Amino acid sequence: KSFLPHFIPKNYSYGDYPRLKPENLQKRDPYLKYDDQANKRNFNEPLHPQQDDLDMWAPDHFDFVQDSIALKWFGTFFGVLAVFSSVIYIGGLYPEKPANPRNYPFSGLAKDLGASSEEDTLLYAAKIDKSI
Amino acid sequence: FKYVRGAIVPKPKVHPGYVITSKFLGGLMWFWIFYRAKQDYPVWFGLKHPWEH
Amino acid sequence: NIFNKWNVTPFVWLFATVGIFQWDKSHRESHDGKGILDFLGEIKVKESLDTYFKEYQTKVA
Amino acid sequence: MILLCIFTPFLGSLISGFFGRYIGVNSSKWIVCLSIFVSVVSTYILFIDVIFNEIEYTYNIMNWL
Amino acid sequence: GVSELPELLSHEEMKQNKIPLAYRDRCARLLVPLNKCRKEGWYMPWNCVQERHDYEQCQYLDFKRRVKELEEIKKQRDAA
Amino acid sequence: HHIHTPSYIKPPTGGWNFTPANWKQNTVLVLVGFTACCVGLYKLGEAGSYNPKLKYKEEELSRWNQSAK
Amino acid sequence: DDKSIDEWAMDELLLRLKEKNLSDVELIDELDKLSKSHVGKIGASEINKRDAVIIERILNGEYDQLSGLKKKEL
Amino acid sequence: DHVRSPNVSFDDIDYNNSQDLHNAQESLLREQWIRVSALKVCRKALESCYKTSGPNHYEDCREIAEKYLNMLPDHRIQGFLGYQKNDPSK
Amino acid sequence: GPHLLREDASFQRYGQLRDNLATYWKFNRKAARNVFIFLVAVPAGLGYLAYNYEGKTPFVGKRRTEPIFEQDYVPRK
Amino acid sequence: NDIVLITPMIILTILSIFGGYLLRDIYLGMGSPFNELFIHPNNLSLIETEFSLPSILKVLPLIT
Ligand SMILES: CCCCCCCCCCCCCCCCCC(=O)OC[C@H](COP(=O)(O)OCCN)OC(=O)CCCCCCCCCCCCCCCCC
Ligand SMILES: CCCCCCCCCCCC(=O)OC[C@H](COP(=O)(O)OCC[N+](C)(C)C)OC(=O)CCCCCCCCCCC
Ligand SMILES: CCCCCCCCCCCC(=O)OC[C@H](COP(=O)(O)OCC[N+](C)(C)C)OC(=O)CCCCCCCCCCC
C-alpha cells in the first residue's frame, strides 16, 4: 500500500525535540474532521522535522506501485520501441527512395542561395541538376 | 415536482429547436462528405490524377 | 463611485504627461530644439569641466 | 488597424480588472467580449490585406534596449 | 494540356516574379500564371482550376524524369 | 444565499457577485470611454503604421549592395 | 537636453559624411532635409524621408579614425 | 552645439600630462562608438534589403550580409585601458 | 494589540528547530561527504570547465565553411 | 443548455466542416508564396508525398 517518500530519515536526534514516526499528511483520511481541514491537521499536533516534505504543500506522492516497478515498466515501454526501431534499421526494411531527389538548374541554384562565385558554389548550392 | 416510484424513463421530448438544429448540422456534414466524395474519390485514393478528366 | 479618488489619479498622470509632452514638442519647434526644462539651467560643457579636472589632478600629483 | 487589433484586448482586461466592481458582473463580461470582437474584425480585415494583397504592416512604438 | 516539361525560365524572370527558391525548377514558367491567378482568385478552390492542374501535371513529369535518373544511375553502380 | 463579508472586502473585481445599484450609469460612462480609446488607437495605428516592403525601391537596394562590396 | 554617447556618435558619423564627400550634390540634399529629430531614425520607419544615398555612402566608406589613434602595430 | 572629438593618440603624448592622457582616453572611446553607429546603419541596410527582396535576399543582400558579419566581431566598445596599458610593438 | 494570530506550540517548536539546526550538527562521515561534494567536487568540475574553454570560444559572427547537404544520392540497391 | 452557450459551438461546427477545404490552397498549394516560412530546395518533398505514394497508404489510416 502506501509508503514514505524518498530522503525521509528513519532516525534523528535534535536535542530534546520530540521524536515521532514520519507521517505523510497527504495520505490521511479526508472524511475525518480536523481543526485545519485543508491541511488535515489538528491544533498543537507535533510536526516532523521535515514536515514540509510530508504535508499537502509538498509534491504529491504516488503510491500505486513502487518506484522500482514503475521505472521497470517505463524502461520496458521505451525498450520495446528501441528494439522495434533498430530491427528495421539493421534489417534495412524501410523503403528505398522511388526517384532521384529533386534537382535544380543554374548550378543547383547556387547564386540564389548566397553563393558569390565558383569557389563557393558547393558551399551553398542544392543538388545540382546535371542533366541541364 | 413529484417523483414517481418504479416508472421507466420514456423517450425524451426535447425542444423542437434542438432536434431540428442537430439534424441540420449533421445533414450539412453528411451532404458535404458525399459531395466531396462524388468529386474527389479518385484523387483521394490515388486512382486518378486531378488534371485527368 | 466610478470617479473616486483612486480611479481618477491614474488618468490624471496620463493627461498631464501627454499634455506636457505635446507642450515640450511645441516648445522645441520655436526654440531650435530646446526643451521645456531649459529654464532650470544648462548642461555644463567639457571646456569648463576639464579645467576643474586639470586643477584636480594637479593637487593630487 | 494594427494598433486596434493588438491592444484592444488589453483594454477589456483593464476595464474588467479595475472597473468591474463599478459596472457589475453582466456589463463586465460583455465589454470584454466587445473588446475581443473588435480585434476579431480588425484581424479579418488584415488577413485579406496581408495574405491576398501581399501587404505588411509595421508599427514601431519606441526603443526598448 | 501539358505534355512535356516547358522551357526553363531565365534568372531575371525568376527574380522579378519572386518564385520561391524551392520551386525554381523546370515548372517555374507554369508557376507564374498560377500564383498570379491565385492572388486575384483569393486562393479559392474554384478560381484557378486549370492553371493549377497544368502546374500539377508539370511536376508529375519532373517526378517521372527523376525516376529515369535513379534507374539510370542504378545501372551504372551495378555495372561498375 | 451565503455570507461574503462585503462591508469591508471590496476588491477591484467585485468580491462575490457584486453589482452596484448605479451599474447602468457607470456602464455608459465606460462604453463611451472605451469607444474613445479604440478610435484613438485606430488614428494612432494608421498614422504610425508603414509597409516595410515598400520603403526602398529595388534599384536603391542594388546600389547598397554594390557599395557594400 | 541630454546627448548620450551613442546619440553623439550617430550625429558625428553623418557630420563626417558631409566633411568627406562635399563634392556629392545628392548627398548634401538628403542631409539638409534630414531634420535633427529624424537624424537618429535612419532606416525603414514611418517617416517619409530620403536617406538611401546617406546609407549608401556609409556602406562604402569607413568614416572612423580608430587606426589613426593606434600608431603602433605588432 | 555638436562638440567634436579631440583626436589624440596614446603614442604621441606623455602620461604624466593628465590632460593629454584624459584626451587620449576620450578620443579612443569616441571613435569606438562611431564604429557601433556605423554597424547599426549597415544593419539597417540589411534589414531593409531582406524585407524588399523576399526570396531574393540571399542574392540581393549578399555583400551587405558579408560586410555585417565581418564588422561584427570588432565594431563594439572595447575601452581604452587595453591600448593605454599595452604596447603592441613590443 | 489583540493577538490576531493563534500561536501553536507545535509550530513554534518546529520553527525554533529549523532556525537552530546548527546546534546539533556533527561533522561525521555523512556530513563530510556532503561538504566535499558541494564545496570541493562541484567547484572543481566548474573550475576545470571554466579554464578549459577560457578564451577558446570565438563565437562572435562564426561563419559556416562546410556544406550542409549531400550532393549525390547513393541508393542502397 | 441555453442559446448563449450553443451559439459559439454552432459557429465552430460549421468551421469544422468547410474551413479546411477553403484554406487548403493558401497553405498546402504548390508554389504558394509563403516566404515567411522558409523551405530549403533540398527539403521540398511535396511531390514525392503526393504522387509516389502507394494507393494503399492513402486509405490505410481510414481503414484502421
Ligand atoms: C502600476 C504602476 C504604474 C506603472 C504603469 C504605467 C507604466 C508606463 C511605462 C511607460 C514608461 C515610459 C515610456 C514612455 C516615455 C517616452 C519615451 C521617449 O522618450 O520617447 C521615445 C519615442 C521617440 O524617441 P525620441 O525621438 O528621442 O523623442 C524624445 C522627445 N523628447 O517617443 C515616443 O514615441 C513616445 C511613445 C510613448 C508611448 C506611450 C506608452 C505606451 C505604453 C507602453 C508601450 C510599450 C510597448 C507595449 C508594451 C506592452 C507589452 C507588449
Ligand atoms: C500585462 C499585465 C496586466 C495586468 C492587469 C489585469 C487586471 C488586474 C486585475 C487586478 C484585480 C484582481 O483580479 O485581483 C484581485 C482579485 C479579487 O478577487 P475577486 O475576483 O474580485 O473576488 C474576490 C474574492 N476573494 C476575496 C476571495 C478573492 O483576486 C485576487 O485577490 C487574486 C489574488 C492575486 C491577484 C493577481 C492580480 C494579477 C497579477 C498580474 C501580474 C502581472
Ligand atoms: C476605458 C479605459 C481602459 C483602461 C482602464 C485603466 C484603469 C486604471 C486603473 C484604475 C483603478 C486603480 O488604479 O485601482 C487601484 C487599485 C484598487 O485598490 P485601491 O485603489 O488601493 O483601493 C483599495 C484601498 N482602500 C480600501 C483604502 C480604498 O489598487 C491596487 O491595489 C492596484 C495595484 C496594481 C495592480 C496592477 C499592477 C500592474 C503591473 C504591471 C503593469 C503593466
Note the ligand closest to the C-alpha atom of F15: 2
Based on the number of CB atoms within 10 Å of its own CB, is H57 exposed (0-12), middle (13-18) or buried (19 or more)?
Answer: buried
Stated in angstroms to one decimal place, the resolution of this structure is 2.8
DSSP letter for G3, please.
Answer: -
Sign of CA dihedral A88, A91, A97, A101: positive
* Residue D62 Cα to ligand 1 middle (Å): 6
Residue F61 near residue H54 (C-beta atoms within 8 A): no
Q: Determine, for residues B45 and J13 on separate chains, whether the beta-carbon distance falls below 8 Å.
A: no
Nearest-CA distance E14 → chain A (Å): 10
Nearest in space to H55 (alpha carbons), one of I63, E28, J37: J37
Kindly identify which residue of chain D lies nearest to residue F23, measuring between CA atoms.
D23
Q: Please report, for residues E42, F18, G55, I29, the alpha-carbon distance to residue D23 in angstroms, rounded to integers and kept in the order given.
A: 44, 9, 55, 67
DSSP E40-62: HTTT-TTTSHHHHHHHHHHHHHH
Centroid of ligand 3 to alpha carbon of D35 (angstroms): 20
- Cell 579614425 sits at which residue? G65
Mark out chain G residues that contact chain H at CB-CB < 8 A. Answer: 5-6, 8-13, 15-16, 42-44, 55, 58-59, 62-66, 68-74
Task: Please state the atom number of ligand 1 nearest to the C-alpha of residue C24.
Answer: 31
Of the candidates F12, C49, A21, the residue with the CA atom closest to the CA atom of residue C57 = C49
CB atoms within 10 A of CB G10: 22
Measured between beta carbons, which residues in chain J are less than 8 angstroms from residue A127? 41-42
**Residue H13 is placed in which grid cell?**
603624448
- Contact check, Cβ <8 Å, D18/C7: yes
Q: Which long-range contacts (CB under 8 A, 24 or more apart) does H86-90 make?
A: H87/G72, H88/G70, H88/G72, H88/G73, H88/G74, H89/G72, H89/G73, H89/G74
Q: Which residue of H has its CA nearest to F66?
A: H63
The residues that bridge with A41 in the sheet, in sequence order, are: A36
For chain E, the chains sharing at least 3 beta-carbon pairs closer than 8 angstroms are A, B, D, H, I, J
Contacts of F35 (CB under 8 A, 6+ apart): none
F28: contact with D, CB 8 A cutoff: no
The whole-angstrom separation of Cα A120 and Cα A122 is 6
H/E stretch holding C9 reads helix C5-29
Query: Residue G55: which of H3, H9, H45 has the nearest Cβ?
Result: H45
Grid cell, residue H8, equals 589624440
Cβ atoms < 10 Å from Cβ of E46: 8
CA of E47 to nearest chain D CA: how many angstroms apart? 14
**What distance in Å separates the CA atoms of residue C24 and residue C35, rounded to the nearest whole number?**
6
Experimental technique: cryo-EM
d(CA J62, CA J64): 6
Q: Which residues of I are less than 8 Å from H70 in CB distance?
A: 61
- Chain A residues whose CB is inside 8 A of the I75 CB are 96-97
What's phi and psi for I53, nearest 5 deg?
-110, 35
Distance of CA H71 to CAs C44, D33, F22, G53, Å?
Answer: 35, 51, 66, 21
CA of F14 to the centre of ligand 2 (A): 10
Ligand 2 centroid to residue F16 C-alpha, Å: 13
For chain A, report the end-to-end CA distance as a whole number of angstroms.
Answer: 74
φ and ψ at residue A123, rounded to 5 degrees: -80, -20
| Residue of D21, D34, D35 with shortest CB distance to F13 | D21
Decide if G3 contacts G20 (C-beta within 8 A): no
**Chain A residues with beta carbon closer than 8 angstroms to that of E63:** 99
- Shortest Cα distance, chain C CAs vs residue D23, angstroms: 9
Running DSSP on this structure, what letter comes out for residue C3? T
Residue J17 Cα distances to B31, J14, J20, angstroms: 11, 5, 7
User: Distance (Å) from the C-alpha of residue E50 to the closest C-alpha of chain B?
Assistant: 8
Distance (Å) of CA I27 to CA F58, I17, I31 = 76, 19, 5
Question: Does ligand 2 lie within 6 Å of residue F6's CB atom?
Answer: no
- Among C42, C44, C45, C50, pick the best mutation site for testing chain H contact (most H Cβ within 10 A): C50
Q: Cα separations (Å) of H1 from B18, C46, G12?
A: 78, 12, 12
What angle in degrees, to the nearest 10, is found between the helix axes of H62-71 and F58-68? 40
Residue contact A99–E14, C-beta within 8 A: no
Residues in chain D, how many? 65
Between CA H6 and CA H8 the distance in angstroms is 6
I11 vs A: CB within 8 A: yes
The per-residue DSSP string of H2-70 comes to --------GGGS-TT-HHHHHHHHHHHHHHHHHHHHHHHHHHHHHHHHHHHHGGGHHHHTHHHHHHHHH
Q: How far apart are CA D33 and CA D26, in angstroms?
A: 11
Question: Ligand 2 atom 5: the closest Cα is on which residue?
Answer: D14
- Range list of β-strands (E), A8-91: none
Of D18, D22, D32, which is best to mutate to test ligand 2, by the most ligand atoms within 8 angstroms of its C-beta? D18
Chain H residues whose beta carbon lies within 8 Å of the beta carbon of residue J40: none
Neighbours of F58 (CB within 10 A): 13
Q: Which stretches of chain A are DSSP H helices?
A: 67-91, 105-109, 121-124
